[PDB]
Design a protein around this ligand. Sequence first.
Ligand SMILES: *C(=O)[C@@H](CC)[C@@H](CNS(=O)(=O)c1ccc([N+](=O)[O-])cc1)C(=O)O
Ligand SMILES: [Ca+2]
Length: 240
Amino acid sequence: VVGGTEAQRNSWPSQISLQYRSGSSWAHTCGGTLIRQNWVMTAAHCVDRELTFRVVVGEHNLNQNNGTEQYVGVQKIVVHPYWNTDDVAAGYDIALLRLAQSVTLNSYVQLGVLPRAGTILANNSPCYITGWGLTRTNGQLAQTLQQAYLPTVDYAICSSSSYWGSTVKNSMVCAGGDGVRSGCQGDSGGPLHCLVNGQYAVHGVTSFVSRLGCNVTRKPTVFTRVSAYISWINNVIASN
Ligand SMILES: *C(=O)[C@@H](CC)[C@@H](CNS(=O)(=O)c1ccc([N+](=O)[O-])cc1)C(=O)O
Ligand SMILES: [Ca+2]
């Protein structure tokens, strides 16, 4: 997250870190959202490489013991059947991960609340992106979880020629674009939490940013619209 602030320890308990095995250690590669005690929602692009993955819940500082983490392997990966790595702009950037064990819920580990199907936010709706992604374009990951206020940018504006044009679809949410605050590499897969009727709900799965850089004016961070895939999500969870 570029232009973020350090999140308080118990503010976003559904945020997870998805990590891959690297030698005798583990490396963060993407965020995700815990949606069932044994299921996490993340981006399909985060699992395009055939790596060994784990999920960490209750995480705050990636480089030190917080005394609140739980570590669990990924037993099954279900990517949206229409996902294509050659066309992230086509959409369908969503995947569900069945965990090998069910995690224990507590004040640091909670399920993410999803929006009702079909819900679309009005332009300029209040949302926060969270994650341990790069803190600058071509920078390095954050040690501590970061948050940034990124107001939505509706579809008509987001798909206009000076913003993202035809690259953005109505199956995505855009947020940000001020040239200061944004998601960045390593935030992919995580949540976009937006306040609606007094409750934060996860409306987006972080998907992409401009090839020009993370925080680029009129290139808001783009997210898979969670409310377009509620049936798919429930269908997977139920048939697995
Ligand atoms: C996500 O982090 C976005 C920017 C918000 C970037 C792409 N994702 S990534 O850099 O985390 C990533 C993770 C995993 C794979 N893979 O397994 O192939 C690829 C990329 C971005 O849009 O540049
Ligand atoms: Ca830690």
